[PDB]
Structure 1
Amino acid sequence: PQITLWKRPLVTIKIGGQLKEALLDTGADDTVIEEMSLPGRWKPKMIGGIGGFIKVRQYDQIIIEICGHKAIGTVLVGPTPVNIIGRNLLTQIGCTLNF
């Protein structure tokens, strides 16, 4: 699909069998999701945002569906303003910028 940017590029995603709203964010290297229960062990990770660096939990090979496209990859969990679908997954669903 083609998504314009007159409004926030928010889509519905599915993780752990639950539907959630998330932002397609080309400015984010990673995918950051609000606090939730994910399977497996996690590793520590520092990500730097507009206001500085924070600590998040990194879960690898997590199954996640984006606007109908299934992806399997790294998902970070921590204090985020909104669910962020970053480049690591956008690339997986073949998302590109065009103008």
Structure 2
Amino acid sequence: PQITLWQRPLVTIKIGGQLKEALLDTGADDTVLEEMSLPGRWKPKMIGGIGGFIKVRQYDQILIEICGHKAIGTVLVGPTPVNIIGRNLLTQIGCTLNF
């Protein structure tokens, strides 16, 4: 699809058997999701944003479906306010910016 930016660019994702809504975020290196129950082993990590840092649990090679496109990569889970699909997964679904 082509998405204009008058509204937040939200998509439906399916991850760990659960449906969620998430922001397509070209400003995000990595993918960061609300506290959620994910299968497998993780690793503690800290990521920084505009206001400081949050602790996240990092899971590698997780399958996500992003608006009907499948990707596999790293997902971080923690106290983010919004679910964010970052460039590590946007590249896999072929997402580009155009103007």
TM-score normalised by the chain length of structure 1: 0.96
What value does the CA root-mean-square deviation take over the aligned residues?
A: 0.8
| Alpha-carbon shift at residue 15 of structure 1 (Å) | 0.7
| Alpha-carbon shift at residue 19 of structure 1 (Å) | 1.0
Q: Any gaps of 5 or more consecutive residues in structure 1? A: none
| Alpha-carbon shift at residue 43 of structure 1 (Å) | 1.1
Secondary structure of the equivalent of 1:27?
Answer: coil
| Alpha-carbon shift at residue 51 of structure 1 (Å) | 0.2
TM-score normalised by the chain length of structure 2: 0.96
| Alpha-carbon shift at residue 2 of structure 1 (Å) | 0.7
Q: How does 1:55-94 map to 2 (within 5 A)?
A: 55-94=55-94
Equivalent pairs, count: 99
The whole-number CA distance in structure 2 between the counterparts of 1:37 and 1:61 is 15
| Alpha-carbon shift at residue 16 of structure 1 (Å) | 1.4
Q: Deviations over 1:22-60 (max 9, x none)?
A: 000001111011111111111122211110122110000
The whole-number CA distance in structure 2 between the counterparts of 1:81 and 1:7 is 17
Q: Any gaps of 5 or more consecutive residues in structure 2? A: none
Percent identity between the two aligned chains: 97
The whole-number CA distance in structure 2 between the counterparts of 1:37 and 1:56 is 13
| Alpha-carbon shift at residue 13 of structure 1 (Å) | 0.4
